[PDB]
Amino acid sequence: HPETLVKVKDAEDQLGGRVGYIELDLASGKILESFRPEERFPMMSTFKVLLCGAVLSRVDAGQEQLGRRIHYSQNDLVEYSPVTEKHLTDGMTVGELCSAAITMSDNTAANLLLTTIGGPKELTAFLHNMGDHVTRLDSWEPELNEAIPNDERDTTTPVAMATTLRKLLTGELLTAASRQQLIDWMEADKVAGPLLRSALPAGWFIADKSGASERGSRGIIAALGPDGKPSRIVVIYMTGSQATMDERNRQIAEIGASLIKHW
Numbered sequence: 001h002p003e004t005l006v007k008v009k010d011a012e013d014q015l016g017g018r019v020g021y022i023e024l025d026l027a028s029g030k031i032l033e034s035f036r037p038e039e040r041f042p043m044m045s046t047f048k049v050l051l052c053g054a055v056l057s058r059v060d061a062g063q064e065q066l067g068r069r070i071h072y073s074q075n076d077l078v079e080y081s082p083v084t085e086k087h088l089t090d091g092m093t094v095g096e097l098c099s100a101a102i103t104m105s106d107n108t109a110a111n112l113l114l115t116t117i118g119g120p121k122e123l124t125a126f127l128h129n130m131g132d133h134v135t136r137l138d139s140w141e142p143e144l145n146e147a148i149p150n151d152e153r154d155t156t157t158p159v160a161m162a163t164t165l166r167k168l169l170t171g172e173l174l175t176a177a178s179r180q181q182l183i184d185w186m187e188a189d190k191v192a193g194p195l196l197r198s199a200l201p202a203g204w205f206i207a208d209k210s211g212a213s214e215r216g217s218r219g220i221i222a223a224l225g226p227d228g229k230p231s232r233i234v235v236i237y238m239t240g241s242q243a244t245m246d247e248r249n250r251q252i253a254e255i256g257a258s259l260i261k262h263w
């Protein structure tokens, strides 16, 4: 198994475009290794974790309740809404919407949640307000993913995303209950099987969120580690290529095999 940085560089050689990577120690926050750490990449659906961090932060501030039920209508439904499209009559709670956004990548759920906070500009404000002056959300779904043509809109860097994710999952920017809730949602991801999960040994813990565009881009953010406990944050982004989805997925899975085999 190639060394992880060797493998990242090889992935980029085979795919074209750029591959960005970072691995942080969860406890300490130290950067363990990286490639293109400060370069921008489209977030795609990886932003949905950040969105639910902002929602949880409002819960912690007494401004939102996870049990608050949101009714919506057919005209709110956008592409790739596998959970929300099934709840037109009953609606969904805020907590259900975060579960759908994170675990199923549901786009209408993400839009509804963005509305709760006032839109993409307000998510960017949340990020700024937690010390992430890099990451930006500009668009709603489905414009955001299924292709962000490479502007700086809707981008992050590997290090900004990793850093921000660690600040949401550890420390005290969220309460203990909210930090746990966020990681629970990510552990329950159902749509990232072909990625890091494909390389994960029995007994490990992973909490993740993936992203994709039709053409060009892919990504994943994760907290993972052996023995049931996450101990590192890994962020991988891909953009700018003409590679197939199967090729993007395989290269992420192969990067994952390297980082597990060298753990």
Ligand SMILES: [Ca+2]
Pocket: 009, 012, 013
């Ligand atoms: Ca290169």
